[PDB]
């Protein structure tokens, strides 16, 4: 029952992304694929075996190789999400690497949670129940283009003026475009680092 028609429809529905890729298109043929995108990594899809599967290279997105399966197999084959969400995850990784020297000693710690596929949250914790802070990161309206609006959650009791006093040397509630968010992330990490090493 539609034995070859299954692969026929699969390829006929997946070839749509070949027009919108605009990256290095594909070095692979049917029963597999590859849409490799680097500067100067590739993702090994699957089509046979379950139903489908994805496979990656060891850096920068393995934090979501369990949220991508549903988006790939169920919704559509329109994975234009990586090409516009890469810098954010690069910043995530560089921050989680730069906070290394603190976790050795008893200085502090930083966690990242990814409440959904787009709504992300980051949390700083300090040793003696001094503080427990959590900032939400979320995209917003697309008048010209998408904009990330990072800050304290909306209806969380702000607990005014305990350390937001210090955190207001950066306005504490930013808004950034999809090309220069790393500067804001680093400027927000350095302040908390200087406040924790004291």
């Amino acid at each position: 029952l539609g034995i070859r028609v299954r692969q026929l429809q699969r390829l006929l529905d997946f070839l749509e992304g070949l027009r919108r890729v605009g990256d290095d298109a594909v070095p692979e043929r049917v029963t597999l694929r590859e849409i490799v995108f680097s500067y100067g990594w590739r993702v090994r899809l699957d089509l046979t075996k379950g139903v489908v599967l994805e496979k990656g290279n060891p850096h920068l997105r393995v934090i979501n190789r369990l949220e991508d399966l549903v988006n790939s197999q169920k919704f559509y084959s329109l994975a234009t999400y990586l090409t516009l969400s890469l810098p954010l995850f690069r910043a995530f990784q560089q921050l989680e690497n730069a906070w290394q020297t603190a976790q050795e000693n008893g200085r502090g710690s930083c966690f990242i949670l990814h409440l959904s596929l787009d709504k992300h949250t980051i949390r700083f914790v300090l040793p003696g129940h001094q503080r427990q802070i959590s900032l939400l990161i979320q995209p917003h309206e697309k008048e010209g283009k998408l904009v990330w609006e990072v800050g304290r959650p909306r209806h969380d009791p702000e607990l005014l003026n305990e350390n937001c006093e210090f955190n207001r040397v950066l306005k504490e509630r930013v808004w950034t475009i999809s090309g220069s968010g790393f500067k804001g992330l680093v400027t927000g990490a350095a302040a908390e680092p200087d406040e924790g090493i004291e």
């Binding site: 990656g56 290279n57 060891p58 850096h59 920068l60 393995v62 934090i63 190789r65 369990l66 949220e67 990784q93 989680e96 976790q103 050795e104 000693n105 008893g106 966690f111 949670l113 409440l115 959904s116 949250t121 949390r123 959650p153 209806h155 969380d156």
Partner: protein
């Protein structure tokens, strides 16, 4: 043998993970025949909800990191698991707050459907419910943080096969 236990202990923890990621949702899809199945929707809801607690108890069985935090105190290793390192990620005090939280969606739904002695486009007090999302997405994650807090302590003793 400690190698053979820490291996597949990391597996038990990776496997109990993604349960939170699948439970973040509740998928309340409503949109006589139509009646008598809202209770079955709530049935499947409480179904997917429960059986997380027994797994929590099974994890608290072989929770063996309260005994390693002591050695971790002074200059503990404390290496967080960055999935950029293990590309596999694949095969080879209370949480009744969740039920207490779900319990506030039958009553504030009855109070929304008790508007037939009322207008048509004013029963939309569902400009509320922006508190339950916050409360759940906080309760589940404030204890999801424990998995990341303990998976680090897991390999404090298994640095290089505990022997080299």
């Amino acid at each position: 043998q400690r190698c053979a236990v820490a291996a597949l202990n990391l597996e038990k923890q990776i496997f109990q993970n993604a349960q939170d990621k699948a439970s973040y949702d509740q998928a309340m899809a409503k949109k006589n025949g139509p009646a008598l199945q809202n209770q079955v929707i709530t049935d499947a809801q409480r179904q997917a909800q429960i059986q997380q607690q027994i797994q929590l108890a099974q994890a608290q069985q072989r929770q063996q990191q309260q005994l390693m935090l002591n050695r971790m105190a002074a200059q503990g290793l404390t290496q967080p698991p960055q999935p950029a390192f293990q590309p596999m990620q694949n095969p080879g005090m209370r949480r009744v707050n969740s039920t207490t939280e779900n319990s506030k969606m039958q009553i504030r739904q009855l109070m929304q459907q008790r508007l037939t002695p009322a207008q048509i486009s004013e029963a939309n007090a569902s400009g509320k419910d922006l508190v339950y999302l916050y409360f759940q997405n906080q309760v589940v994650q404030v204890f999801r943080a424990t998995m990341l807090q303990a998976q680090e302590k897991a390999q404090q003793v298994a640095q290089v096969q505990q022997a080299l």
